[PDB]
Enzyme design. Structure first.
Site, PDB file in Angstrom:
ATOM      1  N   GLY A  14      21.115 -29.805  -1.303  1.00 19.30           N
ATOM      2  CA  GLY A  14      21.528 -29.917   0.147  1.00 19.30           C
ATOM      3  C   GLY A  14      21.891 -28.642   0.927  1.00 19.30           C
ATOM      4  O   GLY A  14      21.119 -27.663   0.943  1.00 19.30           O
ATOM      5  N   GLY A  17      25.619 -30.116  -2.997  1.00 22.10           N
ATOM      6  CA  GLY A  17      25.217 -31.282  -3.750  1.00 22.10           C
ATOM      7  C   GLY A  17      23.791 -31.253  -4.282  1.00 22.10           C
ATOM      8  O   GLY A  17      22.939 -30.459  -3.830  1.00 22.10           O
ATOM      9  N   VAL A  18      23.532 -32.224  -5.170  1.00 18.61           N
ATOM     10  CA  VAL A  18      22.161 -32.508  -5.656  1.00 18.61           C
ATOM     11  C   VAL A  18      21.755 -33.870  -5.033  1.00 18.61           C
ATOM     12  O   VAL A  18      22.571 -34.791  -4.910  1.00 18.61           O
ATOM     13  CB  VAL A  18      21.997 -32.790  -7.185  1.00 18.61           C
ATOM     14  CG1 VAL A  18      20.519 -32.653  -7.603  1.00 18.61           C
ATOM     15  CG2 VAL A  18      22.901 -31.950  -8.112  1.00 18.61           C
ATOM     16  N   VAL A  19      20.473 -33.993  -4.680  1.00 17.44           N
ATOM     17  CA  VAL A  19      19.988 -35.263  -4.150  1.00 17.44           C
ATOM     18  C   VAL A  19      19.077 -36.013  -5.092  1.00 17.44           C
ATOM     19  O   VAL A  19      18.138 -35.414  -5.602  1.00 17.44           O
ATOM     20  CB  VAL A  19      19.250 -35.114  -2.835  1.00 17.44           C
ATOM     21  CG1 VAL A  19      19.043 -36.493  -2.241  1.00 17.44           C
ATOM     22  CG2 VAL A  19      20.031 -34.244  -1.859  1.00 17.44           C
ATOM     23  N   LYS A  34      23.483 -38.284  -2.411  1.00 23.27           N
ATOM     24  CA  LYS A  34      23.905 -36.891  -2.399  1.00 23.27           C
ATOM     25  C   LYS A  34      25.121 -36.857  -3.274  1.00 23.27           C
ATOM     26  O   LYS A  34      26.083 -37.597  -3.030  1.00 23.27           O
ATOM     27  CB  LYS A  34      24.260 -36.441  -0.980  1.00 23.27           C
ATOM     28  CG  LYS A  34      24.176 -34.938  -0.691  1.00 23.27           C
ATOM     29  CD  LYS A  34      23.789 -34.639   0.793  1.00 23.27           C
ATOM     30  CE  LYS A  34      24.462 -33.355   1.333  1.00 23.27           C
ATOM     31  NZ  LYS A  34      24.105 -33.013   2.770  1.00 23.27           N
ATOM     32  N   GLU A  82      19.875 -44.036   3.338  1.00 24.50           N
ATOM     33  CA  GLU A  82      18.598 -44.745   3.272  1.00 24.50           C
ATOM     34  C   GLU A  82      17.594 -43.766   2.733  1.00 24.50           C
ATOM     35  O   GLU A  82      17.644 -42.609   3.095  1.00 24.50           O
ATOM     36  CB  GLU A  82      18.177 -45.226   4.619  1.00 24.50           C
ATOM     37  CG  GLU A  82      18.302 -44.163   5.665  1.00 24.50           C
ATOM     38  CD  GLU A  82      17.281 -44.336   6.748  1.00 24.50           C
ATOM     39  OE1 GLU A  82      16.306 -45.069   6.534  1.00 24.50           O
ATOM     40  OE2 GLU A  82      17.461 -43.727   7.812  1.00 24.50           O
ATOM     41  N   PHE A  83      16.652 -44.235   1.899  1.00 24.98           N
ATOM     42  CA  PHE A  83      15.575 -43.380   1.409  1.00 24.98           C
ATOM     43  C   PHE A  83      14.503 -43.131   2.479  1.00 24.98           C
ATOM     44  O   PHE A  83      14.095 -44.021   3.217  1.00 24.98           O
ATOM     45  CB  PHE A  83      14.885 -44.012   0.232  1.00 24.98           C
ATOM     46  CG  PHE A  83      13.765 -43.188  -0.312  1.00 24.98           C
ATOM     47  CD1 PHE A  83      14.025 -42.013  -0.994  1.00 24.98           C
ATOM     48  CD2 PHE A  83      12.448 -43.585  -0.166  1.00 24.98           C
ATOM     49  CE1 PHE A  83      12.999 -41.253  -1.522  1.00 24.98           C
ATOM     50  CE2 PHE A  83      11.417 -42.830  -0.707  1.00 24.98           C
ATOM     51  CZ  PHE A  83      11.698 -41.660  -1.379  1.00 24.98           C
ATOM     52  N   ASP A 128      21.292 -27.117  12.714  1.00 24.20           N
ATOM     53  CA  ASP A 128      20.351 -26.734  11.698  1.00 24.20           C
ATOM     54  C   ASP A 128      19.077 -27.534  11.706  1.00 24.20           C
ATOM     55  O   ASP A 128      18.679 -28.133  10.690  1.00 24.20           O
ATOM     56  CB  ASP A 128      20.924 -26.668  10.289  1.00 24.20           C
ATOM     57  CG  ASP A 128      20.090 -25.766   9.408  1.00 24.20           C
ATOM     58  OD1 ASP A 128      19.339 -24.917   9.997  1.00 24.20           O
ATOM     59  OD2 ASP A 128      20.144 -25.921   8.174  1.00 24.20           O
TER      60      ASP A 128
HETATM   61  C1  LIG Z   1      12.981 -34.501   1.493  1.00 14.83           C
HETATM   62  C2  LIG Z   1      12.260 -35.330   0.628  1.00 14.83           C
HETATM   63  C3  LIG Z   1      11.055 -34.840   0.100  1.00 14.83           C
HETATM   64  C4  LIG Z   1      10.300 -35.615  -0.783  1.00 14.83           C
HETATM   65  C5  LIG Z   1      10.747 -36.884  -1.146  1.00 14.83           C
HETATM   66  C6  LIG Z   1      11.944 -37.376  -0.613  1.00 14.83           C
HETATM   67  C7  LIG Z   1      12.725 -36.609   0.267  1.00 14.83           C
HETATM   68  C8  LIG Z   1      13.883 -37.110   0.752  1.00 14.83           C
HETATM   69  N1  LIG Z   1      15.040 -36.440   0.914  1.00 14.83           N
HETATM   70  C9  LIG Z   1      15.928 -37.300   1.423  1.00 14.83           C
HETATM   71  C10 LIG Z   1      17.231 -37.205   1.802  1.00 14.83           C
HETATM   72  O1  LIG Z   1      17.916 -36.019   1.675  1.00 14.83           O
HETATM   73  C11 LIG Z   1      17.234 -34.984   2.340  1.00 14.83           C
HETATM   74  C12 LIG Z   1      18.206 -33.920   2.710  1.00 14.83           C
HETATM   75  C13 LIG Z   1      18.638 -33.236   1.408  1.00 14.83           C
HETATM   76  C14 LIG Z   1      19.206 -31.903   1.652  1.00 14.83           C
HETATM   77  C15 LIG Z   1      18.142 -31.050   2.342  1.00 14.83           C
HETATM   78  C16 LIG Z   1      17.965 -31.590   3.738  1.00 14.83           C
HETATM   79  C17 LIG Z   1      17.414 -32.995   3.668  1.00 14.83           C
HETATM   80  N2  LIG Z   1      17.871 -38.276   2.296  1.00 14.83           N
HETATM   81  C18 LIG Z   1      17.209 -39.433   2.407  1.00 14.83           C
HETATM   82  N3  LIG Z   1      17.816 -40.496   2.889  1.00 14.83           N
HETATM   83  N4  LIG Z   1      15.928 -39.530   2.039  1.00 14.83           N
HETATM   84  C19 LIG Z   1      15.293 -38.476   1.550  1.00 14.83           C
HETATM   85  N5  LIG Z   1      14.043 -38.367   1.136  1.00 14.83           N
END
Ligand SMILES: Cc1ccccc1-c1nc2c(OCC3CCCCC3)nc(N)nc2[nH]1
Lengths: 297, 258
Positions: A14, A17-19, A34, A82-83, A128
């Site tokens: 992020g 954090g790790v996602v 997150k 949400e994804f 940002d």
């Molecule tokens: C960004 C991404 C690339 C490929 C596959 C999935 C995702 C993804 N990141 C997500 C995310 O976190 C993205 C966020 C993470 C920290 C960097 C800025 C964007 N949140 C949600 N709700 N869905 C996501 N999908």
């Protein structure tokens, strides 16, 4: 607390954090998690998470990423979102050979401006905006994300943090050290992103603050007191700045039609006060025919 | 930049009512009182000075504390601990450079440990459900200040003082919303310095009238007149600094003639 969530894979990292991608075992919902480490002994809950959560709970809108739940532990803190399937940056790189179709550029820009107006109307700055933080789903949506650097502002604003916005998308009033900045800094970011959707390369890829200003100036002209009352007063303004002629906008982003050029030009107006608001943008004739195409993932 | 001024004003007006502490909460506190709260808040003002913290930070911290106490019964020995954590949270949310946790443990003359302050922080977050972005008198004042014609920063500094004074006495000011206290504050400041009144422009914007502000104005005016004799004095001291054009050194009006 996480008994119900099923890790699928890491997605990345992020402002902290790790996602992870996960499924809710009981409801089948797909989410992004997150995960933030905390400790005691150290500095407690990081102000980024404090802001991100508090602001993200107020901002409920179809083009702003949805914060679904917040899970507490002693040591661990989880934000459940949400994804969404990928980010604009990943998408643009996949659109290498074909380019992004104009109706889709328009759709995406319309929606981002919707979500950004919503932030601005609830006294929030994103600070940002860039393709890495704009998320797209498989049904045509695009959504503002990563409110890690976001902040609640007041009217009129006071001086907020300076070290702000990724370089390439940073507004010139920040690069010039101006004591106030506002909503206009987010619109400049969209401006840049709008140009980047069209040309597929970044509009001002500077590698320092000075190089970044110079790139802006060589495209938009070096601003003076006529284009921007006050510039020659600003802290990081230098009278020895090379004075470049403004380039004709058709040259800046050649594939853009007249309406597009108009919009882009106002989104990149140097004087923040005259630069366009997200609200005002949504009525621009560029959008007269906007629709919502699904992209091709 | 006015493109959003109205939308935002509207929003804060909705949110102030959602973020408002429960008015009679002190009655249900078995061991603490309005007067203990005054002390705590007054101390917070002090901490704000020491660390050169924004007024906004003060006002949020107070908000947090009042909300926390509206559902969490607390013993006097722990009131300062709540206070400390609120202030820490407020700093984190609002400040460019918040002071570090070690500094907060410092200013509580070793009463509490770092671990406690950090735990309390977590509990305040859990209790307020992370809803920290709460409207404050300050945020209202600041908008109202756009309607002075012309700006007079004697007035602006004076309104901030009055506003700030209100934090200390939960009786009666806990029952007035920030927007309204801001209203009274601004009018009272305006009158004292220049002898003018709550502008017509602010009537149009806020919907508030001199009429609708009277209840709070009475309370405020009195608070202004008795300020020199109040048990707590940190705010008066603060507002003598050239920074705020020593407005606390101004004489409150004897009458309002409403
Ligand atoms: C960004 C991404 C690339 C490929 C596959 C999935 C995702 C993804 N990141 C997500 C995310 O976190 C993205 C966020 C993470 C920290 C960097 C800025 C964007 N949140 C949600 N709700 N869905 C996501 N999908």
């Amino acid at each position: 607390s996480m008994e119900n969530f099923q890790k699928v894979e890491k997605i990345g990292e992020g402002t902290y954090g790790v996602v992870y991608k996960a499924r809710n075992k009981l409801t089948g919902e797909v989410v992004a998690l997150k995960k933030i480490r905390l400790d005691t002994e150290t500095e407690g809950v990081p102000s980024t998470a404090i802001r991100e959560i508090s602001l993200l709970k107020e901002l409920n809108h179809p083009n702003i990423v949805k914060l679904l739940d917040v899970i507490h532990t002693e040591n661990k803190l989880y934000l459940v979102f949400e994804f969404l399937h990928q980010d604009l940056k990943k998408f643009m790189d996949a659109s290498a050979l074909t380019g992004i179709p104009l109706p889709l550029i328009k759709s995406y820009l319309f929606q981002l401006l919707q979500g950004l107006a919503f932030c601005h109307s609830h006294r929030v700055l994103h600070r940002d905006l860039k393709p890495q933080n704009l998320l797209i789903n498989t049904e045509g949506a695009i959504k503002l994300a990563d409110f890690g650097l976001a902040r609640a502002f007041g009217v009129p604003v006071r001086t907020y943090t300076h070290e702000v916005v990724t370089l390439w998308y940073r507004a010139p009033e920040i690069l010039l050290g101006c004591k106030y900045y506002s909503t206009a800094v987010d619109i400049w970011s969209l401006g840049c992103i709008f140009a980047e959707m069209v040309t597929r390369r970044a509009l001002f890829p500077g590698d320092s603050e000075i190089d970044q200003l110079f790139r802006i100036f060589r495209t938009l002209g070096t601003p003076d007191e006529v284009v921007w009352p006050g510039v020659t007063s600003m802290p990081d303004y230098k009278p020895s700045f090379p004075k470049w002629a403004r380039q004709d906008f058709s040259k800046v982003v050649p594939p853009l039609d007249e309406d597009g050029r108009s919009l882009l030009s106002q989104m990149l107006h140097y004087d923040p006060n005259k630069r366009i608001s997200a609200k005002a943008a949504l009525a621009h004739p560029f959008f007269q025919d906007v629709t919502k195409p699904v992209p091709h993932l | 930049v006015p493109d959003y001024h109205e939308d935002i004003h509207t929003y804060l007006r909705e949110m102030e009512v959602k973020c408002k502490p429960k008015v009679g909460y002190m009655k249900k506190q078995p061991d603490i009182t309005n007067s203990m709260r005054a002390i705590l808040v007054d101390w917070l003002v002090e901490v704000g000075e020491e660390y050169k913290l924004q007024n906004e930070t003060l006002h949020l911290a107070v908000n947090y504390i009042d909300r926390f106490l509206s559902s969490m019964s607390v013993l006097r020995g722990k009131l300062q601990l709540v206070g400390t954590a609120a202030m820490l949270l407020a700093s984190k949310f609002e400040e460019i450079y918040p002071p570090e946790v070690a500094e907060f443990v410092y200013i509580t003359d070793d009463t509490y440990t770092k671990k406690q302050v950090l735990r309390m922080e977590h509990l305040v977050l859990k209790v307020l459900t992370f809803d920290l972005a709460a409207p404050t008198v300050n945020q209202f004042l600041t908008q109202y200040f756009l309607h002075q014609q012309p700006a007079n920063c004697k007035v602006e500094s004076l309104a901030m003082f009055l506003g700030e004074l209100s934090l200390i006495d939960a009786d009666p000011y806990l029952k007035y919303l920030p927007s309204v206290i801001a209203g009274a504050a601004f009018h009272l400041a305006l009158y004292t310095v220049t002898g003018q009144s709550w502008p017509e422009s602010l009537i149009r914007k806020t919907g508030y009238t001199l009429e609708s502000l009277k209840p709070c104005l009475m309370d405020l005016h009195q608070t202004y007149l008795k300020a020199p004799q109040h048990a707590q004095q940190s705010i008066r001291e603060k507002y003598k600094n050239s920074k705020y054009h020593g407005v606390s050194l101004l004489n409150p009006p004897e009458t309002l003639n409403l």
